[PDB]
A paper describes a structure:
The A-loop of the 23S ribosomal RNA is a critical region of the ribosome involved in stabilizing the CCA-end of A-site-bound transfer RNA. Here, we report the identification of a third system involved in Um2552 formation, consisting of a methyltransferase of the SPOUT (SpoU-TrmD) superfamily encoded by the ttc1712 open reading frame of Thermus thermophilus, herein renamed RlmR. As several SpoU MTases acting on specific nucleotides of the 23S rRNA, RlmR is a dimer and contains, in addition to the SPOUT catalytic domain, an L30-like RNA binding domain. The RlmR overall structure consists of N-terminal (1–96) and C-terminal (∼105–260) domains (NTD and CTD) joined by a linker.
To this end, a 59-mer RNA corresponding to the T. thermophilus 23S rRNA A-loop, centered on U2552, was designed (U2552 59-mer RNA). We next attempted the crystallization in the presence of SAH. This allowed to solve the crystal structure of RlmR in complex with the 59-mer RNA and SAH to a resolution of 1.9 Å. SAH was found in its bent conformation. Moreover, the formation of the complex leads to a different orientation of U2552 and C2556 compared to the 70S ribosome structure. In the herein described crystal structure, the A-loop fits optimally in the central groove formed at the interface between the two protomers and creates extensive Van der Waals contacts with the enzyme. Most importantly, the target hydroxyl group of U2552 is positioned at 2.8 Å of the catalytic R128′ guanidino group (motif I), a catalytic residue identified in TrmH, and at 4.6 Å of SAH sulphur.
Numbering used by the authors:
A (entry chain B): 1 to 210, 212 to 260
B (entry chain A): 0 to 260
Amino acid sequence: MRIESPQNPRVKALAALKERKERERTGRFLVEGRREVERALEAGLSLETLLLGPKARPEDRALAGGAEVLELSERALARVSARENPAQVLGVFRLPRRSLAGVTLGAAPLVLVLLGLEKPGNLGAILRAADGAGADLVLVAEGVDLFSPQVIRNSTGAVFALPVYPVAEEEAARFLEEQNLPLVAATPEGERLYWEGDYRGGVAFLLGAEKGLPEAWKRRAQVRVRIPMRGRADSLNVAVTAALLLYEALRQRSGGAPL
Amino acid sequence: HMRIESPQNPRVKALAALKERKERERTGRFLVEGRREVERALEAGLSLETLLLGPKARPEDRALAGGAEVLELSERALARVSARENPAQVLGVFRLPRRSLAGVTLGAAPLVLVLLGLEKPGNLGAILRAADGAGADLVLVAEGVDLFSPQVIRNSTGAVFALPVYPVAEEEAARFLEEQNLPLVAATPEGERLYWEGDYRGGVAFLLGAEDKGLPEAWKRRAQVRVRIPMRGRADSLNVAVTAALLLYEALRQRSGGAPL
RNA sequence: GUCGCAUCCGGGUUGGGCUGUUCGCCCAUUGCGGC
Ligand SMILES: Nc1ncnc2c1ncn2[C@@H]1O[C@H](CSCC[C@H](N)C(=O)O)[C@@H](O)[C@H]1O
Ligand SMILES: Nc1ncnc2c1ncn2[C@@H]1O[C@H](CSCC[C@H](N)C(=O)O)[C@@H](O)[C@H]1O
């Protein structure tokens, strides 16, 4: 039963999931690492194949829930992993397919809108921040891949439960308009400090790639806000900016007043 | 004054070795990659020993050398020396700076960060970039990844060279803090106080722990207050650099007119 | 998993760790194919 050779045909099929085209073709993707597998399961994703290395714990096998369990050697593990030093627990899950059509927001939502194409590592970090602050919705560009290994790793698995939706620009604009959601453009040259916006009644922050925001979006915004920069640096990391904006809104919703 | 073409030239291997912390210690030199970062190291007063120019360098780059040796690298030799998938066209070999807390004085209400056991150079660089944005008066790096790693330099966009950032032994951080009579505020996910409810308008030192294990218990006890940033989702903790930025900007908000919660 | 070819002392061509994972990262230390 053990799969020992990196050349075994099953290892070949599992390592091919590293490529987005194969993930699309098969409807499957790899989740590497015990914590990320736990989070994918707790999020309700369908585990198809559990992969266990030689150092897996007894409890790891109990995660399978009726999926096929494969025991791989270190050498077979190394061909599937995205890491120089592989995890001992990985899962092959079915790709989730979520549409914004159903989504209904409450009266004072906290929304992040990510415009443009961000690097996978930065995106994963943004989504962790969004999860921490309890964002009700994150919108990203139509072709964004939420199930790359960097997004999964840098999100610490937060990507699985987070309401994040890749959508066309017009679909995003329409959704926001139909919610009558105030748009707040975050830009280093914003006319107001970000503490001066009022986010107690619901906000959609607009954020560009580490890049910048498109002009028509900045102009449509009710307000453009800047994070003060007191040294020589001109800008902060996008994930950091996303966290600063979201936690500011949380502060106000916790009783804080606009500056 | 030399043109190097072979990636296997002896100089090139010497230069790529500077990516190892161990070679930087052995030699006393380090590599600064990227035109902006070289500008910042120069502006900060660091000694440039060797300027490296790639094929797409521009004429003004050569005038940065100020009497250092200037080496011309082909695209292939440049690839070996670069720490990047896509190499920069301007790089400098500088002498490692000598900085001590001996000559540091703080004003009445300084804003300080103490980083304990951080291991990811990208995290350190993002923190330094936030400290720069927020105007921190001092950053103590206690026993973590090395301050002059390529990713610290790159992710701080060179702010590492001008920021008042100092690597210290953990026990020296404790002594410097006691010496300065600075209130210590321990950031930890289980902290009893929401971070917005601390008053940071007086002197304050925020304490941040390691990515994996967090803050040691002894440091939590030293703190006057343990503060937490609320977590509302599935994640149990935030990234250490995001945490640092959130703390720095809450203090800035308060110092800019805002009231504690 | 296994098998050469190197190479270094027959014997070795490493251990670990990681809440940013990417020409992945960190820390002790002491290669290159094929199937
Ligand atoms: N100090 C700051 N104030 C406001 N938004 C900021 C910021 N630093 C970064 N951001 C946000 O982070 C994104 C990526 S950072 C790129 C900044 C770029 N020079 C620009 O002019 O936008 C930006 O699009 C912006 O939305
Ligand atoms: N929600 C939060 N509140 C306060 N500090 C936090 C935080 N998330 C991360 N940090 C900071 O980031 C550092 C690394 S996070 C380490 C997490 C570890 N599981 C633990 O229990 O601490 C922590 O030591 C702390 O200084």
